[PDB]
Amino acid sequence: PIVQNLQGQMVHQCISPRTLNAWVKVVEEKAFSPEVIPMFSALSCGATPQDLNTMLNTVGGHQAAMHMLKETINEEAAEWDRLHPVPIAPGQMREPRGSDIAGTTSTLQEQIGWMTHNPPIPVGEIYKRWIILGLNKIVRMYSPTSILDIRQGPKEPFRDYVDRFYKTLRAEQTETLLVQNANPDCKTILKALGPGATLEEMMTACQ
Amino acid sequence: PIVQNLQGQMVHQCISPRTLNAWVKVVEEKAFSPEVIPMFSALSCGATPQDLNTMLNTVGGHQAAMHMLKETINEEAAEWDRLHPVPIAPGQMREPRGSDIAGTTSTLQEQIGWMTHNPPIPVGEIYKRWIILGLNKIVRMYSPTSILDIRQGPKEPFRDYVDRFYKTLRAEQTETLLVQNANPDCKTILKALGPGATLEEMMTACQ
Amino acid sequence: PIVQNLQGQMVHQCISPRTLNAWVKVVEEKAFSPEVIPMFSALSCGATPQDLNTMLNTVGGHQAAMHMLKETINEEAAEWDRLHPVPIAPGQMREPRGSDIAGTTSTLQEQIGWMTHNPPIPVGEIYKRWIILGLNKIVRMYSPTSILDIRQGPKEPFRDYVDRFYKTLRAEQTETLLVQNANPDCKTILKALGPGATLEEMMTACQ
Amino acid sequence: PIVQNLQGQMVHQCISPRTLNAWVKVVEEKAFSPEVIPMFSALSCGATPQDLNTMLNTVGGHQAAMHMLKETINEEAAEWDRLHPVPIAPGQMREPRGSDIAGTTSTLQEQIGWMTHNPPIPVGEIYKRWIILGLNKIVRMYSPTSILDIRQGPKEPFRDYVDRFYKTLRAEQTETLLVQNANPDCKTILKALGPGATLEEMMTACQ
Amino acid sequence: PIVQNLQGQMVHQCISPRTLNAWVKVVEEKAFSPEVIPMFSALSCGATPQDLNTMLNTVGGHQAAMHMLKETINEEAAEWDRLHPVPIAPGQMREPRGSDIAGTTSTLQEQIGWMTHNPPIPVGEIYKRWIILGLNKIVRMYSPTSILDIRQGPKEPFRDYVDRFYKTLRAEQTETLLVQNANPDCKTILKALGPGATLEEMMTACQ
Amino acid sequence: PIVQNLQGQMVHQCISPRTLNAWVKVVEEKAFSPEVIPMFSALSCGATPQDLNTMLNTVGGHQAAMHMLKETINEEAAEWDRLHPVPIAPGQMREPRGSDIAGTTSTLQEQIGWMTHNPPIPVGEIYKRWIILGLNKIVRMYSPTSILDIRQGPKEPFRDYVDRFYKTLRAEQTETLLVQNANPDCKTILKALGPGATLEEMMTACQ
């Protein structure tokens, strides 16, 4: 990543073995659960496009998703080229192309040059926004259960039902559907509460 | 987080893989036990609102609690706006809104600017206080057993009973109830001790 | 903790995830064995009162001991107030109270101010001494076996017996009792050695 | 590796135990899966030829591949000598040979001298490009299944089939073959979609 | 420990959680095997007497050995007082006593003052030499098997026998006894080799 | 080890717990496999003779090999004394002896003085070369199988056979013997290939 040293200047740092292993492990354990996306964003703090491509390529398996990611990246790369239509002088920064932001036609020194410019061209943050966009579309598609099928069981604790409800809702990307899909006993209690009840009040009443 | 370097200036640091993994793991293992809250506070030392949102979003599951957390955060964010009613000049700090402190309408550079100002606007500590408030309400609600039902067994060691008693009491958020819920043999000993006995004296007498 | 940087000045550092996890784990594995106390002291090197309270609060369970710890802390806090009886000027250090040293009525900035003063008021070391005092009283009470009941078995190796003997003695908080509680065969050998024998000589003779 | 300190100068650093162990472990677990190559590239960030040889030599087993790697390295080393045909003055940098870039006839001080020169001779990056070239040829040869034999099962979820398809394709080093190898039911749906369908659209239709 | 910063001055550093855990773990796994002593010496690099006492006190169990260690320490402390017989002026270093070097009557600031003096009084290295002396006496006593009882089996590989032979010899604290305790077949071969054979030659001949 | 700080000067650093544990673990898991030697060389980057002796002494077991190592070290130490035959002035570097390079008659300060001299006397690298020499002789002797006995099985995959072939060859310290020891079916194919075939071509043909 590009990180500021202990003297106030932005310099390049090698991606750490702890960072590399943490990203690989979370994909192995959680696949494309919704909480994997913020983990990717945190673990790629200050990452260059090269670092972002590194993280994606260390993922073995889920290659269907990785190809969807490339398609989303190319869509965003093509949009950037339509919003930013371009001899380049000696020793002198060039504007980046979509494929430059994606790290495919640009060198690390070029990415360092853009990201540390004054003002900086944050090709890493632009690329990361493309990746998260594509990652979120994967999260929705891999969500196994629709919110319409999350209904509280006749003996299911309300707490467990709300857990499944909003876990599903988070991947699908509320309060009245949560009441409608509650079981008959709790749904009866939740209507007596009236409108405007908080989740805390609702869960307390069906305890 | 925002941490001071080895030269005496406050700069931004990327949240570490060790920090990210430590928060995720403790939630996986302890859920919303009372001791999870001080762990969250320590692991979020110097955190920005972005870092605080990062930590919350890496939690998979317990999504019912996370939605209660959002409701508490919005309540505190709405209160801040009622206590701090607001053209913004070029290059110049703006007062934060409730959603700015919660990291939803503010950028990282803006959060860095507030937290490192002189005097600093500690939007991270303000947000953290909101989160801990909401986290504590979750701890009370998820406490499975009431203090009224913690009574020493006829053969239960007094040490084990006091452990369960104050473990329950900590989540519920004393000395006379501890005597009343003791078993007949120990309760007899504890009355002979008289008032003002310490916990050490009480546990010694029923050993 | 408060640690000196690489330039010779005392500044605040966030308690590390490795430190937090190491304290939690040792309590989970060893409870209140005697060797847990020096581990707590080492892991709290340079800790502020806030850091000391952090470490105590990350302990889940053993809540009976934690309440005994609070009682000991309040006793020491009350003593400090009796030994140090107190408008506070603008921007100007105030003497600490017992509850200030215990981190309950003092801010982190105040604790940093005391600990880094010239001369420093080591509220962290004062608090730590209170905690270790209370922790040691827990170690004695949780010692399951009295030294009077540690006697060498008729076929127990002398090495194993001495291990149990001084393990028990360490928690209870010597040489002649070790001879008296030895088995008949070894006790006969140990009297023939005479007075003033070292532990090495004693263990060698009963090998 | 050669890394810039916190003062802006490139100096030598010892390869870390975390780096050494991370490379060994990934080879033990994944052998020559395609994602092992980007892991090698990231873990060898800023590596000298000595560091690159270190990483290769810590690999136990897969010695057939390591000998293929040497053959590829010698081929690239011989090419470099044909593109760069060479008394060397006292204290004065010499041009490198193919075996110098491969770390076999050059010292660490010589590699440091080339890599930190102005302008730098990046013998580490040149060597790394040779290694990755040879590593990729191993990935293709060790790919067990050909893309022609990746066909969706009659009850295999389309997602799982695309995973295997592009996993195989990645090692072999698309969209119309993916349709042809789909099962009859899904292939019927995919033709109705028409040309130019994205992977996301294709996977959605066969869900 | 006392370690030099990145600016060339000796300052105090808190003993690390990795150091504390590494010492505890090696004692748990290897007890008082001979190789535990050099591990203790390496892990206590630059340690103060306080750090050395910390490491000893984190050891749970083996309390018989720890009491032998104290007896050896007191013997060396008494010797130092006999070799170094002693108003102390304000703000001014005092010569250390045996108990000062052992960390029992001296503060950390005093130990820092001695160790960083010019010229330095290395109370840490003096104490460490006392500890290693006592630790080595424990290694000899806990050696279970005498060298006289290490004899090669009639079908035992010579390599395995030499391993046990010098493992035992290392704890007991050679070449002709190794031949005498070899089995008849190998002993016959080893006499034909003649005097002055290396261990490599000896092991080769009995392979 | 001796490592350069972040200011460009060579200073002493304590051997890290990660380094110590990594060397011990690899010996426990791999014994004297060929790849253990480059691991030792990397983990001893910049090591002093004291650090090199530390690493050897933390190895428990394999004491036969460690005694062969001492014999090789003494041989190299005796050679150095024959190539470098020696009042030493106050405060003034002395030439090292063989036992000085091996760390047996020299202090750490003396080793630091030699290694950081201008020009430096690299007693650590000289000692390390002695150790690796002796370690390699152990690798050859502990190789269980000779290359003459590595022959491809009638149903053994050629890839697996080449793996065993060069694994054995690496420890023993090629292309025509690999053909001769192939099975009849593959050997027939390999002769049809003709001379000068690469390993990649050979393995491809027998696939």
Ligand SMILES: CC(C)(C#Cc1ccc(-c2ccc(Cl)c3c(NS(C)(=O)=O)nn(CC(F)(F)F)c23)c([C@H](Cc2cc(F)cc(F)c2)NC(=O)Cn2nc(C(F)(F)F)c3c2C(F)(F)[C@@H]2C[C@H]32)n1)S(C)(=O)=O
């Ligand atoms: C950069 C990056 C790392 C980021 C970010 C990021 C940025 C801002 C915010 C946020 C913070 C506080 C509030 Cl009060 C609101 C709000 N208030 S409101 C009117 O109630 O919605 N909204 N937001 C998002 C915003 F921006 F959209 F406004 C927020 C979040 C929250 C952080 C959070 C997590 C948590 F657990 C509990 C919290 F209290 C807060 N994370 C989400 O909210 C995700 N989420 N989604 C849904 C669903 F859809 F199912 F309902 C659900 C959540 C949920 F909160 F987890 C919980 C079960 C419900 N994260 S990134 C690109 O990788 O993602």
Ligand SMILES: CC(C)(C#Cc1ccc(-c2ccc(Cl)c3c(NS(C)(=O)=O)nn(CC(F)(F)F)c23)c([C@H](Cc2cc(F)cc(F)c2)NC(=O)Cn2nc(C(F)(F)F)c3c2C(F)(F)[C@@H]2C[C@H]32)n1)S(C)(=O)=O
């Ligand atoms: C920032 C953050 C990390 C913090 C903080 C924080 C700040 C201050 C204090 C504190 C410190 C010392 C004393 Cl003497 C008292 C006191 N003296 S008194 C008159 O006896 O109560 N009070 N306090 C709290 C205060 F502030 F309220 F005053 C304290 C604590 C204690 C730390 C502590 C833990 C411990 F194990 C043993 C100790 F000796 C001290 N932690 C708690 O006390 C929580 N707790 N709750 C209850 C219950 F309710 F069940 F009884 C119980 C505890 C318990 F101690 F664990 C124990 C079983 C009993 N923590 S945060 C926002 O994440 O939490």
Ligand SMILES: CC(C)(C#Cc1ccc(-c2ccc(Cl)c3c(NS(C)(=O)=O)nn(CC(F)(F)F)c23)c([C@H](Cc2cc(F)cc(F)c2)NC(=O)Cn2nc(C(F)(F)F)c3c2C(F)(F)[C@@H]2C[C@H]32)n1)S(C)(=O)=O
């Ligand atoms: C800050 C902190 C981390 C500290 C400290 C701290 C400070 C000083 C000392 C100490 C050091 C050397 C000597 Cl020679 C003596 C001594 N000489 S003497 C006349 O023989 O007793 N005394 N001391 C304590 C002093 F200060 F009281 F003098 C010491 C210790 C020893 C360190 C030690 C541990 C060890 F394993 C082996 C050693 F050789 C030395 N640790 C203890 O001694 C605890 N202990 N208790 C008993 C029992 F009671 F059962 F007998 C037993 C021990 C035992 F040693 F483990 C062993 C089985 C016997 N630690 S803290 C507040 O968290 O604790």
Ligand SMILES: CC(C)(C#Cc1ccc(-c2ccc(Cl)c3c(NS(C)(=O)=O)nn(CC(F)(F)F)c23)c([C@H](Cc2cc(F)cc(F)c2)NC(=O)Cn2nc(C(F)(F)F)c3c2C(F)(F)[C@@H]2C[C@H]32)n1)S(C)(=O)=O
């Ligand atoms: C230095 C080093 C570490 C590097 C690099 C490196 C450099 C650039 C790029 C890259 C980035 C973005 C796009 Cl949009 C394209 C593109 N757009 S396009 C017209 O669709 O192909 N192409 N590229 C490569 C380029 F350079 F060739 F252009 C890219 C990659 C991608 C990174 C990536 C991984 C991922 F998972 C998902 C992504 F969105 C992006 N990694 C690959 O693409 C490897 N891969 N191969 C195939 C296959 F062949 F099977 F189809 C498949 C992949 C796959 F993506 F994983 C996925 C299943 C499909 N890596 S190194 C020497 O060690 O490797």
Ligand SMILES: CC(C)(C#Cc1ccc(-c2ccc(Cl)c3c(NS(C)(=O)=O)nn(CC(F)(F)F)c23)c([C@H](Cc2cc(F)cc(F)c2)NC(=O)Cn2nc(C(F)(F)F)c3c2C(F)(F)[C@@H]2C[C@H]32)n1)S(C)(=O)=O
């Ligand atoms: C500070 C500290 C960490 C230290 C140190 C320390 C200091 C110096 C030396 C040393 C180095 C090289 C040589 Cl050539 C000789 C030598 N040459 S010689 C004429 O043949 O003996 N002697 N020495 C010791 C010296 F100083 F005494 F001279 C050495 C050692 C060796 C290091 C070593 C370990 C190893 F595995 C293989 C090696 F090649 C070298 N470690 C020992 O030798 C311990 N050992 N003991 C015996 C036994 F007794 F069974 F035979 C046996 C060993 C053994 F080597 F392991 C092996 C099985 C045989 N360590 S500390 C206080 O914690 O210990």
Ligand SMILES: CC(C)(C#Cc1ccc(-c2ccc(Cl)c3c(NS(C)(=O)=O)nn(CC(F)(F)F)c23)c([C@H](Cc2cc(F)cc(F)c2)NC(=O)Cn2nc(C(F)(F)F)c3c2C(F)(F)[C@@H]2C[C@H]32)n1)S(C)(=O)=O
């Ligand atoms: C300091 C230290 C850490 C070092 C070093 C060190 C220094 C240089 C080199 C080296 C690098 C590149 C080439 Cl192209 C050749 C070459 N070209 S050539 C004409 O084909 O032989 N030769 N060399 C050695 C040199 F110096 F001798 F020239 C090399 C190596 C290689 C590194 C390497 C490992 C690898 F896996 C794959 C590679 F492509 C390169 N490591 C070895 O080669 C060891 N090895 N041995 C044999 C055997 F004998 F069985 F055939 C076999 C290997 C093998 F490669 F693993 C593989 C199965 C075959 N390491 S240290 C003192 O601890 O060891």
Ligand SMILES: [Cl-]
């Ligand atoms: Cl995966």
Ligand SMILES: [Cl-]
């Ligand atoms: Cl790739």
Ligand SMILES: [Cl-]
């Ligand atoms: Cl821009």
Ligand SMILES: [Cl-]
């Ligand atoms: Cl509930």
Ligand SMILES: [Cl-]
């Ligand atoms: Cl969870």
Ligand SMILES: [Cl-]
């Ligand atoms: Cl999210």
Ligand SMILES: [Cl-]
């Ligand atoms: Cl404010």
Ligand SMILES: [Cl-]
């Ligand atoms: Cl008790």
Ligand SMILES: [Cl-]
């Ligand atoms: Cl616990």
Ligand SMILES: [Cl-]
């Ligand atoms: Cl608490």
